[PDB]
């Protein structure tokens, strides 16, 4: 919350006791809680009479240093799934000169929720199976659409992990974002096409055109026409099979069961082949582009930019060969629907490729493969999100979907929604420059710099990986798809139950607002120390300050127990950070070690290796320094329930006091060095005591003094110096300048803010990269009105927001259960 | 889209726990030649049949169901009078049947757009194919990979029809597929004041149903006493006629009114289209009222009707 | 565990504390839990790959002795199932100029859950006693279809001779194994192309190709086209008999009945037959190989290497002639009526390639003839899947229990497959031994116990010593088994679902790989406790005049034999108690009656006396037998175990407080120091006459405080290893202070070497020699003030480690502040 006075400033939440454990169950974030204030929609649903287009931002007063009030003054929503690869230099558009961001996961088969044989799969074996052994018969006890000697070979030596619907469903929560861009254009904002390219107007009018390898820019066509994967070139290889008999000798373990439940006579039907293809094989099969008309700033020269989305560059899959075996109708014995399959259609895509299909081939014999990326790039202009969610509805009514697509869907947020970095400047609203690496330098939401690709397109050199996630084994699915196992996970339901989030327009603009709680418990992660960007950087193998090997060691996910993911340590502070300040839990996943089952969320996946959230300054260069520092405060303030006493609002100037601080009576000290000049603030009691920190201590968690050393580099000309006064190795930004938020085209009537209220002030240096203790100072000429403001014997005139705190509770309706309608009342005894 | 039932499962009867004690105590007082109590298979399909566990209890809803769309095809053949006129005259309304001469239920006399489906050499309309029917008495003469999918005949279905193979016929469509050929109904209509009168084919809509997902029939026939071998014929038959008059065939030419050897494949819709004048309404009364007579028929018929 | 600093080595349990026996439940150790502490591994240098392919190595930061982080350092998984026949020397592929090698089971009767007479057998003892022949000439069974007859011929038996299936599916275990290369590319390790070949990288792409007969030299092609035994000259015959009235009238005792539940396991019903053959008859029947594409270093002579398998050497079976009987479908030399008692008898697929008696008869079953039984199976040798072993172990769970029966089954097959090179003797990482030498492909168990190598050329003229006692499957128990007229304690049958998942997976070659680790853990710290030197363990029956080093070798393995019964070895109960106790996972067993009392037996138990022990060569390739027995180094000792002994422990960084000490007289220890020599000894144990000489019957005590200590003057890097007086000893001594440290494999894409010492072993400490005599680790008076000075906990020493977990980079300056300093630890669970 924002501070209406400085007594509660004084009586706000610690970092220490926001960060405990909680043991309420509490709602997920839906995204809806910014959603209500930002935007026109308070209520309900609103088709497209509510212009999501225009309603992309953060707006209010501001209330200037000077006493000034500034009427409608700005912050952009600063994340975006679309990295432009056309970028608009001097009004028109020319080709990037950067690389395309891509990220790579860890995907590996851990110990899920326990999986147990069925009262069906003690069938199959007790009966039947067993009487065979006296009748001298090899009868078939066919089960829906496969052999009996297809059940027979998969009823049999069970995985003791359980699988977990994740990968798949992470590509399914993917392509989903994808293709949920060309919904309309009154859905989808335009600060999001503004993000990174800000020299740009996108158009109400036509809307976006979700393509498929037509990037114009280093290589990223990857077969335009003859395709191939964009990670490691190569074209896959699909068959559909009737039998596992006809699995050649080679493979037949990877075979993988099409059940006939999300198959049957309700859609297009032959879809759904390539939504099971696309799920289980490999993301990305190719490179999807979006491309919109977009206008300059004064607009004259409309023209259409190509954008990627981010997650059209997460490399997930290793599933390059697929061999499908489909449900052979009824009951038949073993053979162009040689075996009574239903059917196996290329797609739309005419698609001259190596294999060179001619417009649309209906084809299911025996063997006779073709390739993957051909297959699912026919299939790529007719995933709409209607028929993406009527296929979540048919995978809701045999496995159970509900929660492992919220958790793989924040999970898509927490690795999609990609933000560039900071701009050091004295006031607000700066921004980089065109064609270069800074404007396109970007970073998570955890603060964490994503990696762009070094040579040109298909990639042989495979990066480093970035986060955890599981998979489906094939072998499990084989047989919890066909009624032989069942887990607690894996429990059925209805197409009721599938999320709110599925098959709606509205996903672009709520899902760049579940990635805002995320960054705000991270940033309040990376700022409670503080330990710049250098000492976070060099920091894993450092052989000085064994302290700090231990924060970047304990931060990631890099332990095991029995087989399975144990967690990180220090993700579940950034958790409790996040259900104590946002009062909503984020979604877990479940990971046994044995008996004893615990929960890990993108809070506790990463991985080391990658540079953190760095700070550019006004030309160019890099200011590693500060904190880890992302997205402008007020989004790291207004939109919380709690937020910690050392990030708060500067209260507003209403009497004759404004702005103060925290003296010796709350334990603090001035630092006060060799040379008489310069003065620091009230820091702790420790700071004249070391000057270098020992080999396991750190900066000691102390909102009195971070907010007492923002207090004091707000005032616009400090240094960032030493215990004596000595310069350090870190990169200083060039004068009183702070990291501020990003600057985007104004509309009428509408201002960019004034004097660091779109900044991010609490990113305060505590811990260099030496392991010395980083001061921050004054003149003692330009000192006395900050301490005595500390001493509470005088006022500081800091700049403000002038909007007020609501944080209403949540709805739990979202779009996604509108069971009212009046034709089940009456159908509701029968449920 | 057919379906499996499993809802009224099978309860094992007297019989089937009877010998149940004669194969896991090994009471193997049997002999080669002994058939079962007066109906006549072998006494070695309870190491076959009886042994079987399936909770897969079904019912006669597919059966019955193409049983009752070939009833609603061949009762356009019963009298002019007893159908309507604006029958024949909701698609086409420039039309007057004429009363007199009735309508005559033809089978593949389609014109156009294809739909003589082999006009002399019948293949399936839903799909190329022309299945294979052989008639054997025991599971031990078949083509040694289709026995959990063989098909007994009952002496009772032989004993609906008055014919005795008619019946077969009847059970050879309701049990496999349909539609296995495309029926037509020809009537004569004049114009409207009367003036061109002529002949119209129509096709019934209950012919261009697709229900029926078996193209492979393999039918195992009683044996009329206790005790490849076509010298012994009656080994395990009565008789397998194909069709009276409609012979029409092309490859593997079908006009062989008698043949039953121990183990040989037919053309199933051949078969079919010789049984494809024969199938009368009071035929058809008459196997339903032996079908109600061994099976519960009456709920599970106005389900399907 | 790695440990973090000194403290963690004082506080860890003594080798006497980790070897009682213990009455835990303890699961099995599947290579499905292990493979994750191989790929969740603390680094940030590391590339994290989510494929098998690349997820082999050890990686991790390592911290050196000065004060230097190594990035991503890589120590080599040592363990492959991989002969190469093709060895890429001078830049190219040469075949091998050097034997293969050989192991040999030593089947034995189990007679331990005997047979019950079930309700069918007592059913028909009334119609024999009591003379009730109410029976005719043409009657089957019930509804299995052999004859009635069979009960006047093998209802008759009277046999205490109840078997398991403990070598059919040993066999059939090894088979899997075999053909679980031809999976995928990228499902089988990199480094177990070259754990033995390392000049050599395989590529992803196409997969393995699992031949057989198609070795090039040292025979090998054991009847290319004509297929013989290759462990002695013979084919075999088989004879397909509907009944015991057919036979060749000389072989009725020795009749197998197939039971039609083998005839509808797999659905080709004639795969299954055999399956039968196989797992019945004759291990190996030929020698299969696994040819792989692979490439050199850099990458220029794209070859295909040729392989043999290790589980394709392995002397099992001891039955050659087969007469199997094969099921009625009705109840009725006379080849006019084939089916009289047959479905099928089908020879291969198209894979015919025979000799004398041509066989490519594709149907070939008349009343009673005989076949080339190995060409039988070279037919039926590309045809085993393993999605078909899967369902042909899912109808034998129906049947008969193989759950217990096949965990025993297949880990006896890990146990003496997974073979290891010995070591090489430097000063620093990695060394290995040449392109090709006699001593690279030198191998060894995971039991610290060198395999023979064939010296005669195949098919083998002299069959040498067994290496690990086996049970058998016989006909006479087997034909009572099928018929219901036996059921036994362990074949209670079971689900299909409860069959071991190891069967049939993509994963199993990388599982056996991550299996054999902790056995030879295990083995390794046996070996260790009692610094036995391997001339004494060599020669402890070549010659011996002591009476204790006859004793160690006697009960270590299992010689004993009361009658038809594997009695499970003395000090190898020592061995599954050091699994235990520290893994805390039991490894699997069988049950076994010795004297009437029921007692369980694991492969730490069942081996056999004899052969040369593990090892160590020099970097000229001279043999170094002065070190206890090493196979592996020491990181996968202390990486994998949960509660490790004190005198193998990690060594601590190297520039912290508190960081690298030992153990002097404050902990009862005495220090030799021969300085007139200028040459003194550790910190080690009061000696109670066992000072130059030890008694006739005794040997070395089992201290760790002073085996520790005399491994950290080992490390100092100028070691004698002397005597009482400072004189040389009769064993093989490397030239320097030069441990032996573990096999160099081909580095990757921002990847390390191991540093110093950091991929040795270092426990094996001298301390008996082949003489009975005292071996003293010495260093010079002068240079070891500085290790007397840390046993005093005057001084810390300085050794390399890995930063592994809990192990962090000491500062240089170690400029302490208070205590406590917890920051984020007590808002966790601290």
């Not at chain 1, 209500?36 to 209010?60: C, E, H, K, M, W």
Request: aromatic fraction near 10%; include cysteine; glycine fraction near 6%.
């Amino acid at each position: 919350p924002i501070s209406a006075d400085f007594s509660e400033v004084e009586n706000a939440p610690s970092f220490l006791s926001l960060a405990e454990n909680t043991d309420e169950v509490l709602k997920p974030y839906t995204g809806l809680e910014i959603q209500t204030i930002i935007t026109n929609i308070v209520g309900d649903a609103n088709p497209n009479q509510s212009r999501i287009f225009d309603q992309d931002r953060l707006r209010g007063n501001q209330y200037s240093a000077g006493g000034l009030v500034t009427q409608n003054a700005v912050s952009a929503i600063p994340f975006t799934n679309l990295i432009p690869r056309t970028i608009r230099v001097g009004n028109i558009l020319v080709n990037s000169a950067n690389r395309l961001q891509i990220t790579e996961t860890n995907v590996s088969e851990y110990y899920s929720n326990p999986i147990i044989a069925t009262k069906l799969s003690e069938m199959i074996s007790d009966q039947v199976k067993n009487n065979q052994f006296s009748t001298w018969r090899r009868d078939n006890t066919s089960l829906q659409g496969f052999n009996a000697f297809d059940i027979a070979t998969i009823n049999t030596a069970i995985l003791p992990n359980g699988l977990s619907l994740e990968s798949m469903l992470l590509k399914l929560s993917l392509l989903h974002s994808i293709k949920a861009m060309n919904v309309d254009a009154a859905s989808i904002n335009r600060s999001q096409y503004q993000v990174i390219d800000h020299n740009t107007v996108p158009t109400i009018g036509a809307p976006a055109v979700v393509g498929v390898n037509n990037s114009p820019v280093f290589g990223e066509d990857c077969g335009g026409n003859n395709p191939v994967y964009p990670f490691g070139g190569g074209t896959g290889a699909i068959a559909f099979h009737v039998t596992l008999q006809t699995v050649p000798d080679e493979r037949k373990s990877y075979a993988i069961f099409v059940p006939p439940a999300i198959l049957q006579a309700t859609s297009d039907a032959n879809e759904a082949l390539a939504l099971f293809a696309l799920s289980m094989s490999e993301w990305p099969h190719a490179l999807y582009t979006v491309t919109k008309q977009t206008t300059d700033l004064a607009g004259a020269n409309a023209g259409q930019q190509v954008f990627i989305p981010t997650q059209s560059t997460i490399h997930i899959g290793g599933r390059r060969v697929l061999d499908l075996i489909i449900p052979r109708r009824e009951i038949a014995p073993n053979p162009v629907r040689p075996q009574a399959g239903p059917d196996a259609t290329a797609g739309a895509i005419p698609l001259a490729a190596g294999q060179l299909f001619n417009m649309n081939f209906i084809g299911a014999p025996a063997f006779e493969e073709w390739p993957l990326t051909s297959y699912l790039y026919s299939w790529a202009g007719r995933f709409d999100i209607t028929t993406i969610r009527q296929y979540m509805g048919r995978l809701a009514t045999m496995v159970g979907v509900k929660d492992a697509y919220w958790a793989a869907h924040e999970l898509n947020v927490a690795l999609s929604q990609v933000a560039p970095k900071m701009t050091t400047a004295a006031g607000g609203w700066a921004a980089q420059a065109a064609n270069s690496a800074q404007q396109s330098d970007v970073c998570y939401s955890s603060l964490l710099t994503v990696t762009r690709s070094a040579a040109n397109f298909p990639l042989a050199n495979q990066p480093a990986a970035d986060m955890r996630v599981y998979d489906t084994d094939p072998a499990t699915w084989n047989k919890v798809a066909l009624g032989l196992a069942t887990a607690a996970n894996l429990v059925p339901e209805q197409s009721m139950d599938v999320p709110f989030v599925v098959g709606d327009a509205r996903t672009s603009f709520w899902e760049r607002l579940q990635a805002i709680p995320m960054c705000i418990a991270w940033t309040m992660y990376y700022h409670s120390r503080g330990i710049t960007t250098l000492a976070w950087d060099n920091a894993y193998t450092d052989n000085t300050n064994k302290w700090l090997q231990k924060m970047v060691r304990n931060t990631f996910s890099t332990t095991q127990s029995v087989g399975t993911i144990i967690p990180a340590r220090y993700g579940k502070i950034v958790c409790n950070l996040y259900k104590n300040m946002f009062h909503r839990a984020p979604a877990y996943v479940a990971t046994s070690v044995g008996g004893k089952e615990l929960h890990i969320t993108h809070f506790e996946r990463w991985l080391p290796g990658g540079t953190y959230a760095n700070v550019y300054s006004g030309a160019g260069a890099v200011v590693n320094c500060f904190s880890p520092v992302l997205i402008p405060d007020i989004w790291c303030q207004y939109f919380t329930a709690k937020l910690p006493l050392f990030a708060g609002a500067f209260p507003p100037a209403q009497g004759q006091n404004s702005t103060k601080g925290f003296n010796s009576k709350q334990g603090l000290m001035i630092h006060r060095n060799q040379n008489n000049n310069l003065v620091a603030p009230y820091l702790e009691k420790f700071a004249d005591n070391s000057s270098y920190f020992p080999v396991g201590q750190g900066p000691e968690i102390n909102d009195m003094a971070t907010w007492n050393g923002r207090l004091w580099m707000t005032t616009g000309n400090v240094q960032y110096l030493d215990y004596s006064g000595a310069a350090i190795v870190e990169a200083v930004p060039p004068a009183g300048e702070l990291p501020v938020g990003k600057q985007i085209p104004l509309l009428a009537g509408e201002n960019a803010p004034i004097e660091l209220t779109n900044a991010a002030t609490t990113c305060v240096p505590r811990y260099s990269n030496d392991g010395r203790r980083i001061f921050t100072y004054l003149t003692t000429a330009q000192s006395v009105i900050p301490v005595q403001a500390c001493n509470r014997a005088a006022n500081l005139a800091r700049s403000c927001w002038l909007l007020s705190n609501v944080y209403a509770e949540p709805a739990l309706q979202a779009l996604g259960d509108e069971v009212e309608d009046a034709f089940d009342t009456l159908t509701n005894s029968s449920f | 889209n057919v379906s499996e039932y499993y809802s009224n499962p099978i309860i094992a009867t007297k019989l089937s726990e009877m010998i149940s004690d004669q194969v896991k105590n090994n009471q193997f007082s049997t002999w080669r030649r002994d058939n079962t109590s007066l109906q006549g298979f072998n006494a070695f399909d309870i190491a076959t049949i009886n042994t079987a566990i399936l909770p897969n209890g079904l019912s006669l809803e597919s059966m019955l169901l193409k049983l009752s769309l070939l009833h609603s095809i061949k009762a356009m053949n019963v009298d002019a009078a007893s159908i309507n006129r604006s029958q024949y005259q909701v698609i086409d309304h420039n039309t007057v049947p004429t009363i007199g001469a009735p309508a005559v239920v033809g089978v593949n006399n389609s014109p156009v757009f294809g739909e003589d489906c082999g006009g002399n050499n019948p293949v399936y309309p839903f799909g190329g194919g022309t299945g294979a029917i052989a008639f054997h008495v025991t599971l031990q003469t078949v083509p040694d990979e289709r026995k959990s999918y063989a098909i007994f005949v009952p002496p009772a279905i032989l004993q609906a029809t008055s014919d005795a193979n008619e019946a077969l016929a009847l059970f050879a469509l309701s049990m496999s597929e349909w539609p296995h050929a495309l029926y037509t109904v020809t009537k004569q209509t004049t114009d409207l004041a009367g003036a061109n009168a002529g002949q119209q084919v129509f096709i019934p809509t209950q012919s261009t149903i697709h229900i029926g997902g078996r193209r492979v029939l393999d039918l195992i026939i009683p044996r009329r006493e206790i005790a490849a071998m076509c010298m012994v014929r009656p080994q395990a038959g009565p008789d397998a006629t194909a069709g009276a008059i409609p012979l029409a065939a092309g490859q593997l030419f079908n006009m062989n009114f008698i043949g039953a050897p121990a183990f040989e494949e037919w053309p199933l819709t051949s078969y079919l289209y010789s049984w494809a004048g024969r199938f009368d309404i009071t035929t058809i009364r008459q196997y339903m009222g032996r079908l109600a007579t061994m099976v519960g028929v009456k709920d599970a018929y106005w389900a399907a009707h």
